[PDB]
Amino acid sequence: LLSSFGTPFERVENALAALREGRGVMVLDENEGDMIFPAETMTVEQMALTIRHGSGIVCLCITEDRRKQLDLPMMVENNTSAYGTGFTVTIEAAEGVTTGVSAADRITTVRAAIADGAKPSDLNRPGHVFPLRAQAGGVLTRGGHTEATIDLMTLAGFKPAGVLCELTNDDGTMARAPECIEFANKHNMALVTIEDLVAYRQAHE
Amino acid sequence: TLLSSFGTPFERVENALAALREGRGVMVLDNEGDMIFPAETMTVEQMALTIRHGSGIVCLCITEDRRKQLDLPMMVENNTSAYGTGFTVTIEAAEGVTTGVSAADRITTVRAAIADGAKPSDLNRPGHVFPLRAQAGGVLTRGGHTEATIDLMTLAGFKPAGVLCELTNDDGTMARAPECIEFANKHNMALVTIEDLVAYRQAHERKAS
Ligand SMILES: [Cs+]
Ligand SMILES: [Cs+]
Ligand SMILES: [Cs+]
Ligand SMILES: [Cs+]
């Protein structure tokens, strides 16, 4: 499917180069493709893009360290979700936003959460940005898009914080693999799969 | 003007109830405009439209009774005078969904939560549908979109549960009134303001006899 885009390891390398250039990455894993960007570089336009063509449940993948720094509890005590998704309580920047919902507000909230020296008070809760706490050990622990996001950010030289959202078709169905490729090509995003990244990590372990 | 486009305040209300019953949506404005549909009749297609044109944070407005029935805690504890945002912990249907994100899945989750006899175990947590618990008293208590939604469903004759989402423009800004009007027209939706509803309910409230 992506072979035309290079071997698995080239795909990973290509994704890291895209991230370093501030572009997004379409990470594939029933296909689910997530658009991901580094939290440090994501722009208002990229956020608008993600709301318009994504599920609109735009998530901020963070480490357990960061979660604890922000004093953010996990959303539920007893996670009964099918995949054990690491949602914490939701967040909104305590300053610089109005309703929290616009692309510029969401990006404001992301930036507040990821800032060096960010404190709990910098964020009100609940809000319209959804932090996901990535499992320690990344994709080698849990082959989820959350873990893929953090691993790609750290491999690319960024802070371990990234933004993801599932690509959705206008008709409400989730974008199929070829549809993800089309979108990636159209928006200058690299394409990689979670399996590619797991393989890359295992080879470099 | 709202008057030119949708009628006087009471007409707007009445037209919104009719739209609801007929299976069309309603735009509720405060500017923040939310597209709303009865949770018991909303279709997959309406859900898709809601996700395509809204924030994608698609919420299910419920009553306190329903929240207690589902055993859904509030997302963040409250111990003040303030009402709060209304968010409970998020949900996914325990059955009949895969990732919970698609329009079809979201609808399945909604239907599971509002079913007669629904039980806590019919829902996993967390999930991709965001319940909002309405303040008892509706808009007369709190003039929010959540309360407006429930009041409209109640007035229209449905179960007190509705789905809402904020209308967003493609560039990521929130739609102002004029864009809301334009969207309602394009999509055959009715349009009403929260103030209209407050007024309407007051006029039929505490009437003698
Ligand atoms: Cs930045
Ligand atoms: Cs959207
Ligand atoms: Cs970097
Ligand atoms: Cs969307």
mmCIF file of all heavy atoms in Angstrom, chain A residues 50-56 168, chain B residues 51-54 56, ligand 4:
data_model
loop_
_atom_site.group_PDB
_atom_site.id
_atom_site.type_symbol
_atom_site.label_atom_id
_atom_site.label_comp_id
_atom_site.label_asym_id
_atom_site.label_seq_id
_atom_site.Cartn_x
_atom_site.Cartn_y
_atom_site.Cartn_z
ATOM 1 N N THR A 50 -7.391 20.213 10.723
ATOM 2 C CA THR A 50 -7.680 19.022 11.485
ATOM 3 C C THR A 50 -9.131 19.020 11.932
ATOM 4 O O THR A 50 -9.814 17.970 11.904
ATOM 5 C CB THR A 50 -6.685 18.722 12.665
ATOM 6 O OG1 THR A 50 -6.912 19.611 13.724
ATOM 7 C CG2 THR A 50 -5.291 18.976 12.126
ATOM 8 N N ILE A 51 -9.654 20.218 12.339
ATOM 9 C CA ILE A 51 -11.065 20.251 12.704
ATOM 10 C C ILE A 51 -11.970 20.004 11.491
ATOM 11 O O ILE A 51 -12.991 19.313 11.571
ATOM 12 C CB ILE A 51 -11.415 21.584 13.360
ATOM 13 C CG1 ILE A 51 -10.673 21.730 14.704
ATOM 14 C CG2 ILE A 51 -12.937 21.621 13.597
ATOM 15 C CD1 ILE A 51 -10.610 23.184 15.245
ATOM 16 N N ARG A 52 -11.626 20.608 10.349
ATOM 17 C CA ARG A 52 -12.466 20.494 9.166
ATOM 18 C C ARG A 52 -12.443 19.073 8.584
ATOM 19 O O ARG A 52 -13.486 18.522 8.263
ATOM 20 C CB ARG A 52 -11.917 21.495 8.152
ATOM 21 C CG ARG A 52 -12.358 21.359 6.731
ATOM 22 C CD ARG A 52 -13.881 21.415 6.575
ATOM 23 N NE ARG A 52 -14.301 21.025 5.224
ATOM 24 C CZ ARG A 52 -14.650 19.801 4.832
ATOM 25 N NH1 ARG A 52 -14.719 18.804 5.709
ATOM 26 N NH2 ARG A 52 -14.984 19.578 3.546
ATOM 27 N N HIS A 53 -11.297 18.424 8.466
ATOM 28 C CA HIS A 53 -11.262 17.112 7.876
ATOM 29 C C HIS A 53 -11.071 15.957 8.855
ATOM 30 O O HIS A 53 -11.035 14.787 8.410
ATOM 31 C CB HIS A 53 -10.111 17.008 6.880
ATOM 32 C CG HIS A 53 -10.400 17.852 5.709
ATOM 33 N ND1 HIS A 53 -9.757 19.072 5.520
ATOM 34 C CD2 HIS A 53 -11.349 17.700 4.781
ATOM 35 C CE1 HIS A 53 -10.240 19.600 4.418
ATOM 36 N NE2 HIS A 53 -11.246 18.839 4.012
ATOM 37 N N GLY A 54 -10.937 16.276 10.129
ATOM 38 C CA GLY A 54 -10.779 15.228 11.114
ATOM 39 C C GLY A 54 -12.071 14.962 11.861
ATOM 40 O O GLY A 54 -13.108 15.505 11.485
ATOM 41 N N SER A 55 -12.021 14.128 12.862
ATOM 42 C CA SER A 55 -13.148 13.873 13.706
ATOM 43 C C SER A 55 -13.537 15.116 14.529
ATOM 44 O O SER A 55 -14.667 15.190 15.085
ATOM 45 C CB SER A 55 -12.834 12.771 14.675
ATOM 46 O OG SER A 55 -11.875 13.263 15.573
ATOM 47 N N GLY A 56 -12.571 16.070 14.652
ATOM 48 C CA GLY A 56 -12.793 17.281 15.448
ATOM 49 C C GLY A 56 -12.493 17.021 16.948
ATOM 50 O O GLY A 56 -12.437 17.956 17.729
ATOM 51 N N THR A 168 -11.506 11.903 8.823
ATOM 52 C CA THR A 168 -12.899 11.527 8.588
ATOM 53 C C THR A 168 -13.397 12.026 7.192
ATOM 54 O O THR A 168 -13.085 13.149 6.783
ATOM 55 C CB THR A 168 -13.792 12.157 9.701
ATOM 56 O OG1 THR A 168 -13.275 11.668 10.938
ATOM 57 C CG2 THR A 168 -15.232 11.670 9.628
ATOM 58 N N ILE B 51 -20.729 16.501 12.161
ATOM 59 C CA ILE B 51 -19.246 16.410 12.268
ATOM 60 C C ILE B 51 -18.484 17.195 11.207
ATOM 61 O O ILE B 51 -17.428 17.811 11.442
ATOM 62 C CB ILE B 51 -18.744 14.953 12.189
ATOM 63 C CG1 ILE B 51 -19.230 14.137 13.394
ATOM 64 C CG2 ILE B 51 -17.227 14.942 12.093
ATOM 65 C CD1 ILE B 51 -19.263 12.628 13.039
ATOM 66 N N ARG B 52 -19.045 17.180 10.009
ATOM 67 C CA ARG B 52 -18.398 17.901 8.890
ATOM 68 C C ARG B 52 -18.372 19.429 9.077
ATOM 69 O O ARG B 52 -17.373 20.115 8.893
ATOM 70 C CB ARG B 52 -19.257 17.511 7.653
ATOM 71 C CG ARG B 52 -18.914 18.306 6.412
ATOM 72 C CD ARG B 52 -17.422 18.490 6.265
ATOM 73 N NE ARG B 52 -17.409 19.612 5.323
ATOM 74 C CZ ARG B 52 -17.234 20.945 5.489
ATOM 75 N NH1 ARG B 52 -16.827 21.587 6.588
ATOM 76 N NH2 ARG B 52 -17.325 21.685 4.376
ATOM 77 N N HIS B 53 -19.501 19.952 9.555
ATOM 78 C CA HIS B 53 -19.581 21.416 9.676
ATOM 79 C C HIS B 53 -19.391 22.032 11.085
ATOM 80 O O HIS B 53 -19.405 23.268 11.206
ATOM 81 C CB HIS B 53 -20.972 21.910 9.183
ATOM 82 C CG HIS B 53 -21.071 21.746 7.702
ATOM 83 N ND1 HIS B 53 -20.269 22.494 6.833
ATOM 84 C CD2 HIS B 53 -21.811 20.842 6.964
ATOM 85 C CE1 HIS B 53 -20.579 22.054 5.601
ATOM 86 N NE2 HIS B 53 -21.516 21.093 5.638
ATOM 87 N N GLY B 54 -19.368 21.173 12.100
ATOM 88 C CA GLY B 54 -19.282 21.654 13.458
ATOM 89 C C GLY B 54 -17.885 21.488 13.964
ATOM 90 O O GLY B 54 -16.955 21.147 13.222
ATOM 91 N N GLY B 56 -16.913 19.150 15.790
ATOM 92 C CA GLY B 56 -16.632 17.740 15.912
ATOM 93 C C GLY B 56 -16.754 17.314 17.391
ATOM 94 O O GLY B 56 -16.701 16.110 17.693
HETATM 95 CS CS CS C 4 -14.940 17.354 10.463
#
